[PDB]
Amino acid sequence: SAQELKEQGNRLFVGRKYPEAAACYGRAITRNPLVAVYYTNRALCYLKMQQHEQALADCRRALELDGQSVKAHFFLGQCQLEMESYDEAIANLQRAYSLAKEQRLNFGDDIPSALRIAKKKRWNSIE
Amino acid sequence: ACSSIWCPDG
């Protein structure tokens, strides 16, 4: 079952076993490859493993399955921030903020904190 | 509780 594999992947993430968790989200994908959350969860694994190219590919797969995904736009913004595409990264982080507000999701100050990091980096490069 | 955005959904 893809949901059981997603939950196992979640337990491995909490135990800081990121490649093991990504492999488990891959098993969930094999069982049902039409669920955006598995790609988003694996993209997060890739960011922790510093594999932004593989994280980016998963964000695009997730956005094709769920255009309203807060986490997919957020993780996409983090990839673009790592690649120094500041304008695109800010736009994705801003979209993530907008979708979280619409969906009544509360991640504390995570999204505004991230936008502040991106705007600071955009200014440094323009200076 | 894993309430941060840097957490997988689940």
From Swiss-Prot, chain A:
It is found in: Cytoplasm; Nucleus; Mitochondrion. TPR repeats lie at residues 2-35, 36-69, 71-103. The modification Phosphoserine is found at S1, S125. Expressed in differentiated myotubes (at protein level). Highly expressed in skeletal muscle, heart, pancreas, brain and placenta. Detected in kidney, liver and lung. Auto-ubiquitinated; mediated by UBE2D1 and UBE2D2 and enhanced in the presence of MAP2K5. Induction: Up-regulated by inflammatory signals in regulatory T-cells (Treg). Transmembrane segments: none annotated. Changing E4K: In SCAR16; reduces protein level; does not reduce ubiquitin ligase activity and autoubiquitination. It is linked to Spinocerebellar ataxia, autosomal recessive, 16: A form of spinocerebellar ataxia, a clinically and genetically heterogeneous group of cerebellar disorders. Patients show progressive incoordination of gait and often poor coordination of hands, speech and eye movements, due to degeneration of the cerebellum with variable involvement of the brainstem and spinal cord. SCAR16 is characterized by truncal and limb ataxia resulting in gait instability. Additionally, patients may show dysarthria, nystagmus, spasticity of the lower limbs, and mild peripheral sensory neuropathy. Spinocerebellar ataxia 48: A form of spinocerebellar ataxia, a clinically and genetically heterogeneous group of cerebellar disorders. Patients show progressive incoordination of gait and often poor coordination of hands, speech and eye movements, due to degeneration of the cerebellum with variable involvement of the brainstem and spinal cord. SCA48 is an autosomal dominant neurodegenerative disease characterized by onset in mid-adulthood of progressive cognitive decline and gait ataxia, and vermian and hemispheric cerebellar atrophy. The U-box domain is required for the ubiquitin protein ligase activity. The TPR domain is essential for ubiquitination mediated by UBE2D1. Antibodies against STUB1 are found in patients with chronic lymphocytic leukemia (CLL) and in colorectal cancer patients. E3 ubiquitin-protein ligase which targets misfolded chaperone substrates towards proteasomal degradation. Plays a role in the maintenance of mitochondrial morphology and promotes mitophagic removal of dysfunctional mitochondria; thereby acts as a protector against apoptosis in response to cellular stress. Negatively regulates vascular smooth muscle contraction, via degradation of the transcriptional activator MYOCD and subsequent loss of transcription of genes involved in vascular smooth muscle contraction. Homodimer. Interacts with BAG2. Interacts with E2 ubiquitin conjugating enzymes UBE2D1, UBE2D2 and UBE2D3. Detected in a ternary complex containing STUB1, HSPA1A and HSPBP1. Part of a complex composed of STUB1/CHIP, VCP/p97, CHRNA3, and UBXN2A that modulates the ubiquitination and endoplasmic reticulum-associated degradation (ERAD) of CHRNA3. Within the complex UBXN2A acts as a scaffold protein required for the interaction of CHRNA3 with VCP/p97, this interaction also inhibits CHRNA3 ubiquitination by STUB1/CHIP and subsequently ERAD. Interacts with MKKS. Interacts with DNAAF4. This is E3 ubiquitin-protein ligase CHIP. It comes from Homo sapiens.
